[PDB]
Amino acid sequence: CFPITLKFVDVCYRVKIHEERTILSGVTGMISPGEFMAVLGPSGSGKSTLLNAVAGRLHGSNLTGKILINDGKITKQTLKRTGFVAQDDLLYPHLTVRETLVFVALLRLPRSLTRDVKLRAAESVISELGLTKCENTVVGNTFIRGISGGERKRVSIAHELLINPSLLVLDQPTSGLDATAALRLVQTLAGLAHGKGKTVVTSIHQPSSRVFQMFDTVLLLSEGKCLFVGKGRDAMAYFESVGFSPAFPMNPADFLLDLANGVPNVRQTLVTAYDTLLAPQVKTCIITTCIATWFSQLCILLHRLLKERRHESFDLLRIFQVVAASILCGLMWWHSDYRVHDRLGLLFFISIFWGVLPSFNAVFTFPQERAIFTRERASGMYTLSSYFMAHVLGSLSMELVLPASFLTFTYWMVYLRPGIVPFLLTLSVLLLYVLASQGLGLALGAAIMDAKKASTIVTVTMLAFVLTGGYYVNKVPSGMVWMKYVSTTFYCYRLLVAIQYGSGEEILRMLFVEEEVIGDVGMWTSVGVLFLMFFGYRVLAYLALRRIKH
Amino acid sequence: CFPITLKFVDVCYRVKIHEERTILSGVTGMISPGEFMAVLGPSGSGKSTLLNAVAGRLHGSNLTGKILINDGKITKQTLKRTGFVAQDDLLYPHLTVRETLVFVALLRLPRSLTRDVKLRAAESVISELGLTKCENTVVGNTFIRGISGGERKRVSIAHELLINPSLLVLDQPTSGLDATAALRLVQTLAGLAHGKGKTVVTSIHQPSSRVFQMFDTVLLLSEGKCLFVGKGRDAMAYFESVGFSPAFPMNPADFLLDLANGVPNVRQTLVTAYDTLLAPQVKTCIITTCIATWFSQLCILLHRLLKERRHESFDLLRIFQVVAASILCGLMWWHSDYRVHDRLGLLFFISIFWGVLPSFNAVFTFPQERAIFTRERASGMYTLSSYFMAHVLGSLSMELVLPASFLTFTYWMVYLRPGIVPFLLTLSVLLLYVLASQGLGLALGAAIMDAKKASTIVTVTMLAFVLTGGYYVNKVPSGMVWMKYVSTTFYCYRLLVAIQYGSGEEILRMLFVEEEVIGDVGMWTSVGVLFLMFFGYRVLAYLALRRIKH
Ligand SMILES: Nc1ncnc2c1ncn2[C@@H]1O[C@H](COP(=O)(O)OP(=O)(O)OP(=O)(O)O)[C@@H](O)[C@H]1O
Ligand SMILES: Nc1ncnc2c1ncn2[C@@H]1O[C@H](COP(=O)(O)OP(=O)(O)OP(=O)(O)O)[C@@H](O)[C@H]1O
């Protein structure tokens, strides 16, 4: 019941010439709750920069104004009561529209309500916006042909009607629908402000006259400076104080947008007849359930993420290629015996393979979710902890079956140390190393939010780890022995060599000894550092995601 | 001067319920040259599927109709005379709008004209659409804040006015501009059909009445079936034959879209009053400069691609990380001598590094250009040969300076074979191997147009090449010796070992001999296969790009 009163005074936004050009220059206005606003202007004006300014999405040293919610600046608490509908529609392309609106319903409604109230509120906004025939079809990308471009927008307004916010900042909501859905959409957005008493800000672009009668305070913009702030029928008459009237009966909207360019420099005489005639008048007018919440927000964000990857049939081919690589690694060391250089080669090639394959595929988790994650993080839907521990729990379904299907062939074809306990110890060490190296691909990929930029960082880093993982050079300079402890391949190599060759007495009985496990690190201080790396790379991937608010 | 007469008869398009739903059902119409059409309807109708059908962009077993240009089906020759302006605007985000319109001007105009005619035609469409104040600013992505959303559309119509096509199929051109740029844009598209005599098809959505007076044949659609085909003022009067008229004076457009839904099942009585009253009336109405062209199309597509990567300052950091990895590889083998296992380790780690780093970064060239390349390839702007030999010549500027900056440190810090001829032979073999392995990342990445799907194919393939590149296993089964010839790491390893250790007599004098160059392959039949691979992987990357027409 937060009564948002939005007041902006003298906001200016200048970008560098890439001098500087003024996008906005001196915009003032007051939006008390109940007032249905409208931001009009030509297609270069500064409307969407003003709407990205008052919705908090624009911050920086460029803005030289004061945006005030309830006579205070924009906090983080008011940024979860403000609903923002952007121009471009960024949605999850593999869901349908019913799963999208159901997940936004279940994740954002007050949680004191039962589940069927949370579903009837989701299918009470589908019938209100008219998305009933496209209810059970996909909302896909440019390539994945899904729903229309006018239903990819009526979904992205019901995406923010299931928040019930107190300040509704819509950025061109109806540019994309016909003239009989525009009227019903503005009837909805006016029944949310002459009904439930909210604060609605619209940037409508090409209205009719009976879509213009619904507005209570129109902001007419022109090249950054505003021409009019005030009522609907006071416009089309305020411009008779300066002497501009149509010669024949037309709509008010195309006339107010004809005067917005100058259709003897009409624009500047309206700007100076604004600034001193009717601008000083607006200058005188101005715990135990906190856990259950977090676990429901994990079940939802995991059930969505497991619906995203049911479309992907490029996982049987991943399994069949890793099986082929395992058959290769088994058939080449087929003629190996237990007695050791030829086997340390295999136990280092496994450490190369499963530090290179998970870390080079984990750089596509967070960069490929960026355009939707920034939007949902700015909106304030879920917590970042519950979002991060859904990708973490979503990778751990097929990043545990590929090394198991690898090792199930390449153990019993090479005929390594027989018995079920060294096999299970080898499999557990391989799975722990895979999860430890996947954290590196998570962290480089959350820190540099670009798959192409991070794929040449993680490649050089994993090759430096493969280099200083104890196999290649014999006599390393002793001021540089310390680097193999920072490696992640070193611990897995030491553990695999330890598991296969004991602490080493039976080999010293049968038969160098230098890089075989009679050596440097123990067996528990090499699983105590793999677990530390598995936790620390994910803590760093969370801390590098905490910076992305925008 | 191709006089396109577009005629579609009984086109139906059904998608599977993911039974089947009819998107379109029985659409007929004739567009002779000079007729300015308009496709109207509600926001679920089947307009953009009809416009993707008649512009050739929809093909498949779903379409059960006949699209006819000049009483013949759509060839590839007519697909370079048809201009299609899609709903979503896919543009190159790093250019400005002036470079974008200049490159489309220089690349598509008849080439018999001089260059300044080709530039005055480019800045004669900027002033016509009004893009003069946003002429020299960027057109960037969702992240890169560039021009507006109404200037990201007035650019994507001047993108297809600099073709001068004979059939102009616009898909919602004005949904995004105000009511005084809509009138001027439809004045332009009507002066292209009452002027230069073309065939213009528009899907306008929210028109005025004086944007509706410009239309010569309106197609009113409703839920896939069409309600009206014919003149402008014959609509608003044909619906008086069935008995629907407004009670008070309004625009024709909102009335024709109010009847399009049923505002006693009005929609079906209009469909059956269409099908037998005024549908049978339309059933009765129905060399040495060829090289210079290709080289100009290479200079343009290369000067654009070198403008795309001037924004990237993440290349000094690539150079500084590869320099750090080289300093690492030098400092670890700092204590190496010329006399050989410790050096074959280094000559195989270089072969690992420069087969892993180029092939894992070359998978982002063609998947990251996909959404714009499919559009330009469907449009018919450049040839695929000249497009492919611009990415090929664009990678070869920093995929030749990273191995040189690597080797310049890691040769003289390890102190390998001294002299300028083994150094230059090593550098040339390294550059040839880098270009040979970059072709693998090109081919897997053109074949599977997804960076995430191809990054787990190229990783397993390069690890299989590293495995069967002659270093790891000692006694491979002899039915599997043949696999190292398919490898690309094997030839570079053999060449580096040959260059450093001769054919081998001085080492047999100073001092195994088995995997040192006294061995299997020669020195010329290992550069004759690296060149074959360098050509064959790029031929496969061209053949896998030839399938993407869409
Ligand atoms: N980062 C930037 N750098 C340079 N110029 C910019 C930048 N962002 C916006 N502009 C310019 O400032 C003007 C205002 O942009 P804005 O997004 O407000 O337009 P708009 O009113 O949203 O357009 P429309 O109403 O057609 O969507 C635009 O014409 C644009 O060219
Ligand atoms: N691949 C598909 N699978 C299932 N349904 C589809 C598919 N493509 C389109 N549709 C449905 O068919 C209808 C027609 O889509 P179309 O793109 O023609 O709408 P439109 O007329 O372009 O909408 P608008 O005019 O608002 O842009 C849409 O409502 C959409 O839901």
UniProtKB/Swiss-Prot annotation, chains A, B:
**What PROSITE patterns does this protein map onto?**
ABC_TRANSPORTER_2
What name is this protein filed under? ABC transporter G family member 25
ABC transmembrane type-2 domain location is 296-501
Protein family according to the UniProt entry:
Belongs to the ABC transporter superfamily. ABCG family. Eye pigment precursor importer (TC 3.A.1.204) subfamily.
Please give, as recorded in its UniProt entry, the membrane topology of this protein: Multi-pass membrane protein
Where does this protein come from, organism-wise? Arabidopsis thaliana (Mouse-ear cress)
ABC transporter domain segment(s): 19-248
Q: Where is this chain glycosylated?
A: N62
The UniProt entry lists the main location of this chain as membrane
